[PDB]
A paper describes a structure:
We observed a similar molecular glue behaviour of pAgs in alpacas (Vicugna pacos, Vp), to our knowledge the first non-primate species known to have a pAg-reactive Vγ9Vδ2 T cell subset. Alpacas possess three butyrophilin molecules: VpBTN3, VpBTN2 and VpBTN1. Among these, VpBTN3 accommodates pAgs and is required for γδ T cell activation. HMBPP, DMAPP and IPP (in order of activity) promote the association between the VpBTN3 butyrophilin full intracellular domain (BFI) and VpBTN2 BFI, but not with the VpBTN1 BFI. A structural analysis revealed that VpBTN2, resembling human BTN2A1, shares conserved residues (such as Arg475, Thr508 and Val509) that are essential for pAg-induced association with BTN3A1. A VpBTN2 BFI variant with mutations in these key residues abolishes its binding affinity for VpBTN3 BFI in the presence of HMBPP. Thus, in both humans and alpacas, structurally diverse pAgs function as molecular glues, enabling the formation of a composite interface between butyrophilins.
Vγ9Vδ2 T cells—a major subtype of human circulating γδ T cells—respond to multiple cancers and infectious diseases in an MHC-independent manner; they are specifically activated by small, non-peptidic diphosphate metabolites called pAgs. The sensing of pAgs in target cells requires a surface protein, BTN3A112–17, that has both intracellular and extracellular domains. Here we show how—in both humans and alpaca—multiple pAgs function as ‘molecular glues’ to promote heteromeric association between the intracellular domains of BTN3A1 and the structurally similar butyrophilin BTN2A1. The BTN3A1–pAg complex functions as a composite interface that directly binds to BTN2A1, bridged by the pAg molecule at the centre of the interface.
Residue numbers in the entry:
A (entry chain D): 336 to 513
B (entry chain B): 325 to 519
C (entry chain A): 324 to 520
D (entry chain C): 334 to 513
Write the structure that this text describes.
């Protein structure tokens, strides 16, 4: 009921500290920000990178291999978001994201941040989008557990898969191919 | 790039019962009181005083001595502040501060968000990153982190904020290091310069 | 006019073989052995010193250094041009404006004549630099008190932070500049007593 | 036939350090708490707390008297037009600064390299600066009793010379130039 999406990371949107794999599937972090041009599409403050392809309508889904990562946040964002200074990643600011911080605190990046009580920490999360209905939901791609879903909102403009990592840990954030 | 801000108070902004020093780098509350004209550029009901220089970008920080002072509240506020009346100095009104009350430290200066500090602070730092909504406070004894306020979307210029509810002892603002500025350096150099 | 709290990071290419730097390059120890490293023209070979990375040629800058439990140390500013090889004295004529602890005393300009009569033991020392003023000062960061300002010098060239570790007891910590909650999630209740690595 | 030309020296506000305060008659000099917001034109001493006169000397012998009074810190004299004004330089004849003065209210010094410690019998309340461009003389006297204070080693003067005044301290007594 949701079209599988072949998502790849767009390095030109990557924060100067984020490392995009050669296949544009894995996402790591460096010790310090890299000397890269500050093109208007690149994220400068938030440790965020987008996909290469957007979604203007339909029902799409992709699965993210979060693995052992003790910090990660995934979701979607409007194209008209601010990428050069700090914005509170919130549906009001065009950000529909969930994730994990500190290895145990699962939260939905809303305002206020909704504290999720995940029974079993997911090793692979599935992001589900539904433009015309305004539904953003995240599931445990392994055992199908519903993690969280955002309230219905009327989407404006295109949507891009957004990925944010803050820590420098061994295990990387990889996107599962479709 | 971090800026070691040299914060001097603005007597316009100051309160009619706070008494600034001549350098305007210290403030104290005594029995006598000013009776200065309550213009729109100043505070009247709640004891407050602001720094003249207001920031609109970059990273800035400054230190403040509060040794042997009972009740104080240091932090950062906007330049588009409310200056008349007695509203709550809570992030919703544009005031992010760190305070002491009842021998306790409270974040956001609201009674239930109390900080669990294991030692009394004699000199605190006030950090500000404009492009990050970052307003942080530091324990300058070990340069350790104390508290970072909930990240605020900054509209216009902000400026240093100071509030003294303690009559006992003055609140000192640490000036930026000036080296040997305005002072003759002998052939052997200055040794343990004081004043 | 404006003071810049510097974020100093050591340069391992200038680090004496007996100097062991941390992964963040913000602290250094004197190891029991040598590292068997190349003797590149940037590295000190006889005196145990290491410089900061970014150099200064104008403006006001300062950095704090934790020197607690270090018996023989020397810190300050030096010229980018100073000779790395040899055992030349760390004096202003050779391009070194330094504050030193030697023989359980404090010596300015690394001179036995200029003993500093401090009665408090230094734990965190701030190194002040004002290029246009020829000013190299030092401060006791416990009370933000003044220690010593070196004789005014026409610098004429880029200047770099200078560090000499002479003991094997305890490391030399170069305090990084405050970065607030950079790269850290501030919870809805605010970030309380952050301790990082 | 005249012995010298008495100089009617008035302070040039366009050269004064942003921390200095020039009077309305341009005769008195005072300091401020912090620097003013004045443009950093080339003629302004941005680092040293110095100020120049308005007219220079290309030749001849000139003399003027400066009232120092109870001031605990002051330094006066002449200097070349090509002196360094935007950063610190040691005010010595080597750098084009012929200056003497008082520091800490008691230590009189001729600002040479190294500074010369002066022994002053009677603290001068009014100092006279004598300049002889032809013989390279820069001389300082006690204007009240005419007694000599200090004379710099005679030099070959290059370029015009300016009356320069330097004060580092804020105090009630001001550095005042006495009119011709
Ligand atoms: C450090 C950083 C973002 C942290 O943002 P926040 O501090 O607002 O925390 P969160 O509510 O999880 O978004 C760069 O992406
Ligand atoms: C602070 C200052 C000048 C101090 O210069 P110096 O440090 O060379 O001292 P002095 O020998 O009296 O000239 C500004 O005029």
């Amino acid at each position: 009921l949701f079209q599988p999406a072949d998502v790849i990371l767009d390095p030109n949107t990557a924060n100067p500290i984020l490392l995009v794999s050669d296949d544009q599937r894995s996402l790591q972090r460096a010790d310090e920000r890299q000397n890269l041009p500050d093109n208007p599409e690149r994220f400068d403050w938030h440790y965020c990178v987008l996909g290469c392809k957007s979604f203007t309508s339909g029902r799409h889904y992709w699965e993210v291999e979060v693995g052992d990562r003790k910090e990660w946040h995934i979701g979607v964002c409007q194209e008209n978001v601010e990428r050069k200074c700090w914005v509170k990643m919130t549906p009001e600011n065009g950000f529909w994201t969930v994730g994990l911080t500190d290895g145990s605190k699962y939260r939905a990046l809303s305002d206020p941040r909704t504290k999720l009580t995940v029974a079993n920490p997911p090793q692979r999360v599935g992001v589900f989008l539904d433009y015309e209905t305004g539904e953003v939901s995240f599931y445990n791609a392994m055992d199908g557990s519903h993690i969280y879903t955002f309230p219905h909102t009327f989407f404006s403009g295109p949507l891009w898969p957004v990925f944010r990592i803050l820590t420098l840990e061994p295990t990387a954030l990889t996107i599962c191919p479709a | 790039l971090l800026h070691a801000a040299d914060v001097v108070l603005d007597p316009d902004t100051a309160h009619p019962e706070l008494f600034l020093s001549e350098d305007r780098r210290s403030v104290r509350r005594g029995p006598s009181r000013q009776s200065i004209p309550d213009n729109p550029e100043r505070f009247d009901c709640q004891p407050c005083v602001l720094g003249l220089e207001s920031f609109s970008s970059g990273r800035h920080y400054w230190e403040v001595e509060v040794e042997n002072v009972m009740v104080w509240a240091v932090g950062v506020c906007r330049d588009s502040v409310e200056r008349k009346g007695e509203a709550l100095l809570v992030p919703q009104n544009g005031f992010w501060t760190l305070e002491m009350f009842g021998n306790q430290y409270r974040a956001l200066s609201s009674p239930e968000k109390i900080l669990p500090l294991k030692e009394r602070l004699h000199r605190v730092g006030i950090f500000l990153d404009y492009e990050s909504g970052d307003v942080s406070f530091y324990n300058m004894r070990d340069r350790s982190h104390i508290y970072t306020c909930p990240r605020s979307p900054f509209s216009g210029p902000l400026r240093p904020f100071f509030r003294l509810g303690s009559d006992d002892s003055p609140l000192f603002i640490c000036p930026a290091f000036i080296g040997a500025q305005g002072v003759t350096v002998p052939e052997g150099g200055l040794v343990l310069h004081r004043a």
